[PDB]
Amino acid sequence: SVFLDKDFTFVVSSEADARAFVQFDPEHTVARPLPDSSDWEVTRKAGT
Amino acid sequence: SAALGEFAEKVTGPDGVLASAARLVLNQLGLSDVVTTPEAATDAEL
Amino acid sequence: SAALGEFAEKVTGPDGVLASAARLVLNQLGLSDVVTTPEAATDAEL
Amino acid sequence: SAALGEFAEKVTGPDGVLASAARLVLNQLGLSDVVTTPEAATDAEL
Numbered sequence: 025s026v027f028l029d030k031d032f033t034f035v036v037s038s039e040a041d042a043r044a045f046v047q048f049d050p051e052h053t054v055a056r057p058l059p060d061s062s063d064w065e066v067t068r069k070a071g072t
Numbered sequence: 073s074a075a076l077g078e079f080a081e082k083v084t085g086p087d088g089v090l091a092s093a094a095r096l097v098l099n100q101l102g103l104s105d106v107v108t109t110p111e112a113a114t115d116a117e118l
Numbered sequence: 119s120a121a122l123g124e125f126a127e128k129v130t131g132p133d134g135v136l137a138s139a140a141r142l143v144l145n146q147l148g149l150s151d152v153v154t155t156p157e158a159a160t161d162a163e164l
Numbered sequence: 165s166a167a168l169g170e171f172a173e174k175v176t177g178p179d180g181v182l183a184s185a186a187r188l189v190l191n192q193l194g195l196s197d198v199v200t201t202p203e204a205a206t207d208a209e210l
Contacts, residue, residue, distance in 0.1 A: 054102065056102065065102070075167065078171055082174075092134055092138075096131070132189065135185050139178045139181050139185065140182055143179060143182060154200075158207070158208075161204070162204075162207055
């Protein structure tokens with residue numbers, strides 16, 4: 025178990041999996057709908 | 073088919089130059105959160 | 119104590135410029151493996 | 165034969181960008197001297 029010191033590069037994920045991401049971190053993670061593909065980007069900030 | 077293959081690589085480089093420089097000026101990318109649309113969607117729902 | 123603080127940041131930037139440019143020319147960093155020394159160490163042991 | 169001729173010139177440029185930037189960070193190139201191998205060669209000779 026390690027704490028991320030600086031924000032990780034965004035990765036593509038499904039809406040169901042990305043909303044889940046938010047349920048753990050939520051101050052520490054960031055998720056957005058990609059308008060064209062309807063999927064979500066998952067970006068882990070510092071402190072994750 | 074297209075000889076342009078190295079012109080695709082030449083796009084990637086400045087993107088890195090762009091991205092790295094953008095972080096120095098603290099210009100924030102990927103700032104879109106849940107603020108406006110769903111509230112409007114809630115209003116449009118009512 | 120030292121006002122040099124922003125001159126530390128100004129070192130980091132070209133390092134990124136250096137590192138990114140180095141990958142383009144395929145100059146390989148962190149190439150040291152187990153090849154010479156331990157064989158010599160084995161020879162020096164005998 | 166190969167249209168790549170200007171892509172050879174485009175390699176040279178960043179090399180200059182690489183070399184110039186490398187001197188700023190005081191990263192030393194061409195550091196290999198007589199230290200290890202001949203001593204090992206002397207040991208391997210004995």
